[PDB]
Design a protein around this ligand. Structure first.
Ligand SMILES: [Zn+2]
Ligand SMILES: [Zn+2]
Lengths: 196, 199
């Protein structure tokens, strides 16, 4: 699969949003789901519903097929951390978890949530993990500032303190992951349980 | 819940095993299961099959019901690290995990093996994450000598060194977790993944 990184681009979500509503694109997006078999190119989540498309280069003015790839809503919100929670888009909380990368985290969240709605006895051991990962939101606060566990604030943090190198910006924010909220995605989860 | 902690007791397994094969224990063995609702008191795993009963305080000359708690076999083998692999009991490999407790790693392994047994489209994700933890085994051997990722060797080594107290225990076991091997538990894993369907 491809690579995942927390990105806080300034005015890029405007283009990602304006493109998704632009009906010239609603024919391109039907191609992009099929060329990738409706599978997220980051964690592998495969579902016929509620899939998004993100640019790998970050520039949403270029639209060549080699750039647009499929991504679930858990991974799509990683390209716009500054907007996760703005006007209803996305939902989650930043946590400190070195043991898992971002892709392994999201693909694990799909298994947990699916094993929570489809209560199979494993709903117990699943909630005792999701809340356990949600507990790391305090550690992110004792390391960057009050309320910086909210992705809307942290997005403006890494935007204010401008760091251009994808190397220092990496070592600084190392071991910080975006844990997608179970509540803000209740509709996608339950509809994925049926469509199976 | 309670507090899960890796323990290298001197010979409590020879007592823990000798009790499990006793008829006087099997009588009220059901009461502890009925009390804790067939749920592990360390990682919250619920199942009506292949559950263990351990003593909290590590002493097996005390058997009051207020001490015997229900523990899944993942957490149960953490009270006998020196026996993991001895006599065919349990299985696993010690790894150096930074910020993740044992009770969280155990409950995490349940979810991964349920995605390996019932390959509903998450087997690659479940295997790749499990192999990410089975790699931290070398970090342990780089801090205690060769072959110390094996819990039967690492366990007996620290028994041969005089580790008797409790606060020394927490120091030498700090940020060390016992990752149960999926191969050594396939029988109980499939039994769980099958009897854990919807309705
Ligand atoms: Zn994804
Ligand atoms: Zn347990």
């Amino acid at each position: 699969r491809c690579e995942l990184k927390l990105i806080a681009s300034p005015g890029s979500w405007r283009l990602y949003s304006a493109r998704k509503i632009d009906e010239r694109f609603k024919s391109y997006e039907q191609k992009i789901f099929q060329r990738d078999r409706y599978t997220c190119q980051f964690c592998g989540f495969q579902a016929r519903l509620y899939q998004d498309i993100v640019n790998l280069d970050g520039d949403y003015t270029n639209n060549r097929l080699s750039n647009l790839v499929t991504a679930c809503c858990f991974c799509a919100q990683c390209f716009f951390v500054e907007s996760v929670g703005v006007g209803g888009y996305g939902g989650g909380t930043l946590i400190y978890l070195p043991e898992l990368t971002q892709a392994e985290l999201n693909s694990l969240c799909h298994v947990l949530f699916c094993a929570i709605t489809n209560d199979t006895g494993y709903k117990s051991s699943a909630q005792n993990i999701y809340r356990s990962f949600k507990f790391r939101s305090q550690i992110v606060e004792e390391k960057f500032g009050e309320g910086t566990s909210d992705p809307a604030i942290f997005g403006q943090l890494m935007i204010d303190s401008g760091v251009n190198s994808e190397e220092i910006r990496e070592k600084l924010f190392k071991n910080i992951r975006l844990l997608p909220s179970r509540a803000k995605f209740r509709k996608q989860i339950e509809k994925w349980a049926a469509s199976a």
